[PDB]
């Protein structure tokens, strides 16, 4: 091997588990949030709104999910769009073509949904990697260095990173800060926050 | 109203060094007292270094240049760098006095000087070697570090560290952080108020790989935290600046390595500085996700610092 110079160093495993499946990801709106902080301050925040609004939207009623599926149309595929999120161009003509017409838009927006999910494991991916770089704490880490297996627990701390997100936003501009703030919320008060 | 800078950068990459050029240049320096509290580092800095210069030579198999400096390798490999004092990367004089023998009769091996340039294949300072080719005046019974020997002194950063100076009736805050992994989750702590951040990377690493977990090339975990630090939106308002630091090292280093041996899309002479110099620049330059302030120096070197120091004020005082 050969020793080194500085023995005394302190290097310092559930969090991976989690942080690497947006599926595990979802059902902890505590470790959610710090990726939604990862997100907004590092990269491009329209691909994980645009997937968990439409999420929402696959969850409810057709009967009460009209006016949801013509905001994330608005927000995240018109042609101008704030928060505009690139899909296959099949499906965007395919999702237009339904939601003007009145039919059922889920199975198109699942799809639109898994070609989004390659551009967030992607972020997902960077993550970990700054997590590997022991900067977890630059994006609220810290607040998870005391939660128990606890369902409530947890919701109960994402109410309040979630209240602290305010400071990214802001270095947002209202034709986007708007429209975020507006998709978070849709999800997180789905999640029960 | 003050000027709060904050040093980043990975472990090893100069911050310290810098610090302590800002006491000299701009403090109250480091006068004899203050030096010779650092001769314990220093001593410990030779023994510890030297101890990994036999390890290597043995499990690297290189020849010993005399098999008879096998009798110092085994007292020096026998010094226990776990005991209270070593550990806290101190050596007394009486002690190194003790060990001065066997390290001079190690350090003039040809065996222990091929093992320390292969270093790259194992972890060590070079001023590891700057202090051995200095074992006459580190012997002497009455020695006194010298302001260069502080400013090569080594000692990996634990905690955040604060030194405020003024210049020319402008208050500067300057703050220092541990950059070696596990330090790193101390740094969240240190941006409110900051007005710039200064990026150090040691230029001469691209041939290394990382103490934390030897796989990991140095070069690319600096341009991996840049990358985060840089595109943070929260430090929009931050001016950032970096410091391809140890100029003088990778000087030396490029005469006898090549960089495209570590990153193919290296296109130019291997042995020209600039040229290396200018594709280091590029690869950070593209870390940024949509003006890079940049500077090669030398943190060591008291008169380079001193010029550069000049240059980064007066881009901070007009960002
Ligand atoms: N030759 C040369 N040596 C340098 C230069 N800058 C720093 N060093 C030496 O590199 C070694 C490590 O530098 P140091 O200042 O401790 O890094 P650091 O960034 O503070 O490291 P850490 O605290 O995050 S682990 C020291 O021995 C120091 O004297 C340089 O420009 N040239
Ligand atoms: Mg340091």
């Not at chain 1, 020793?3 to 969090?15: A, C, L, Q, T, V």
């Not at chain 2, 005046?137 to 009455?142: E, M, Q, Y």
């Given at each position: 091997?050969?020793?080194?110079?500085?023995?005394?160093?302190?290097?310092?495993?559930?969090?991976?588990?989690?942080?690497?499946?947006?599926?595990?990801?979802?059902?902890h709106?505590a470790?959610?949030?710090?990726?939604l902080?990862?997100?907004?301050?590092?990269?491009?925040?329209?691909?994980?709104?645009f997937?968990?609004?439409?999420?929402?939207?696959?969850?409810?009623?057709?009967?009460?999910?009209?006016?949801?599926?013509?905001?994330?149309?608005?927000?995240?595929?018109?042609?101008?769009?704030?928060?505009?999120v690139?899909?296959?161009?099949?499906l965007?003509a395919?999702?237009?073509?339904?939601?003007?017409?009145?039919?059922?838009?889920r199975?198109?927006?699942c799809?639109?949904?898994?070609?989004?999910?390659?551009?967030?494991?992607?972020?997902?991916?960077?993550y970990?990697?700054?997590?590997?770089?022991?900067?977890?704490?630059?994006?609220?880490?810290?607040?998870?260095?005391?939660?128990?297996?606890?369902?409530?627990?947890?919701?109960?701390?994402?109410?309040?990173?979630?209240?602290?997100?305010?400071?990214?936003?802001?270095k947002?501009?209202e034709?986007?800060?708007?429209?975020?703030?507006f998709?978070?919320?849709?999800?997180?008060?789905?999640?029960?926050? | 109203?003050?000027?709060?800078?904050?040093?980043?950068?990975?472990?090893?990459?100069?911050?310290?060094?810098?610090?302590?050029?800002m006491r000299?240049?701009?403090?109250?320096?480091?006068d004899?007292?203050?030096?010779?509290?650092?001769?314990?580092?220093?001593?410990?800095?030779?023994?510890?270094?030297?101890?990994?210069?036999?390890?290597?030579r043995?499990?690297?198999?290189?020849?010993?240049?005399?098999?008879?400096?096998?009798?110092h390798?085994?007292?020096?490999?026998?010094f226990?760098?776990?005991?209270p004092?070593?550990?806290?990367?101190?050596?007394?004089?009486?002690?190194?006095?003790?060990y001065?023998?066997?390290?001079?009769?190690?350090?003039?091996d040809?065996?222990?000087?091929?093992?320390?340039?292969?270093?790259?294949?194992?972890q060590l300072?070079?001023s590891?070697?700057?202090?051995?080719?200095?074992?006459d005046?580190?012997?002497?019974?009455?020695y006194?570090?010298?302001?260069?020997?502080?400013?090569?002194?080594?000692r990996?950063?634990?905690?955040?560290?604060?030194?405020?100076?003024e210049?020319?009736?402008?208050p500067?805050?300057?703050?220092?952080?541990?950059?070696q992994?596990?330090?790193?989750?101390?740094?969240?702590?240190?941006?409110?108020?900051?007005?710039?951040?200064?990026?150090?990377?040691?230029?001469?690493?691209?041939?290394?790989?990382?103490?934390?977990?030897?796989?990991?090339?140095?070069?690319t975990?600096?341009?991996?935290?840049?990358?985060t630090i840089?595109?943070?939106?929260?430090?929009?308002?931050?001016?950032?600046?970096?410091?391809?630091?140890?100029?003088?090292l990778?000087?030396e280093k490029?005469?006898?390595v090549?960089?495209?041996?570590?990153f193919?899309?290296?296109?130019?002479?291997?042995?020209?500085?600039?040229?290396?110099?200018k594709?280091?620049?590029?690869?950070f330059?593209?870390?940024?996700?949509?003006?890079?302030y940049?500077?090669?120096?030398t943190?060591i070197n008291?008169?380079?610092?001193?010029?550069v120091?000049?240059?980064?004020?007066?881009?901070?005082?007009?960002?």
């Open positions: 091997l050969i020793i080194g110079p500085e023995e005394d160093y302190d290097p310092g495993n559930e969090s991976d588990i989690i942080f690497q499946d947006l599926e595990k990801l979802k059902s709106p470790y959610l949030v710090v990726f902080r990862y997100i907004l301050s590092q990269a491009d925040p329209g691909p994980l709104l997937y968990l609004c439409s999420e929402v939207y696959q969850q409810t009623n057709p009967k009460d999910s009209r006016s949801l599926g013509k905001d994330i149309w608005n927000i995240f595929l018109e042609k101008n769009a704030p928060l505009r690139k899909i296959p161009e099949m965007q395919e999702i237009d073509l339904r939601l003007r017409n009145n039919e059922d838009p199975n198109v927006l799809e639109a949904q898994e070609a989004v999910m390659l551009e967030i494991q992607e972020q997902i991916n960077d970990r990697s700054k997590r590997t770089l022991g900067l977890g704490s630059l994006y609220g880490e810290n607040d998870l260095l005391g939660l128990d297996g606890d369902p409530l627990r947890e919701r109960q701390m994402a109410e309040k990173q979630l209240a602290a997100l305010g400071d990214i936003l802001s947002y501009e034709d986007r800060s708007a429209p975020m703030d998709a978070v919320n849709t999800f997180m008060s789905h999640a029960g926050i | 109203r003050l000027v709060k800078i904050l040093l980043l950068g990975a472990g090893e990459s100069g911050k310290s060094t810098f610090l302590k050029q000299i240049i701009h403090g109250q320096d480091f004899q007292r203050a030096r010779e509290e650092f001769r314990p580092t220093i001593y410990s800095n030779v023994i510890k270094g030297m101890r990994v210069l036999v390890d290597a043995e499990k690297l198999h290189i020849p010993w240049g005399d098999n008879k400096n096998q009798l390798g085994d007292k020096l490999m026998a226990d760098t776990r005991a004092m070593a550990a806290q990367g101190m050596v007394e004089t009486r002690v190194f006095l003790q001065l023998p066997a390290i001079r009769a190690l350090w003039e040809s065996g222990i000087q091929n093992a320390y340039d292969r270093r790259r294949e194992f300072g070079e590891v070697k700057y202090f051995l080719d200095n074992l005046k580190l012997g002497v019974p009455d006194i570090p010298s302001q260069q020997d502080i400013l090569l002194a080594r990996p950063t634990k905690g955040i560290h604060e030194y405020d100076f210049i020319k009736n402008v500067f805050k300057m703050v220092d952080v541990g950059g992994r596990s330090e790193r989750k101390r740094w969240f702590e240190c941006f409110d108020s900051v007005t710039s951040i200064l990026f150090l990377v040691s230029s001469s690493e691209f041939d290394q790989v990382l103490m934390e977990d030897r796989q990991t090339n140095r070069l975990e600096s341009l991996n935290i840049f990358e840089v595109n943070n939106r929260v430090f929009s308002n931050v001016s950032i600046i970096l410091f391809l630091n140890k100029t003088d990778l000087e490029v005469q006898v090549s960089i495209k041996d570590y193919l899309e290296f296109e130019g002479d291997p042995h020209c500085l600039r040229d290396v110099q594709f280091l620049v590029e690869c330059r593209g870390k940024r996700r949509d003006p890079l940049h500077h090669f120096t943190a008291t008169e380079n610092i001193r010029l120091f000049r240059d980064v004020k007066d881009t901070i005082l007009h960002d």
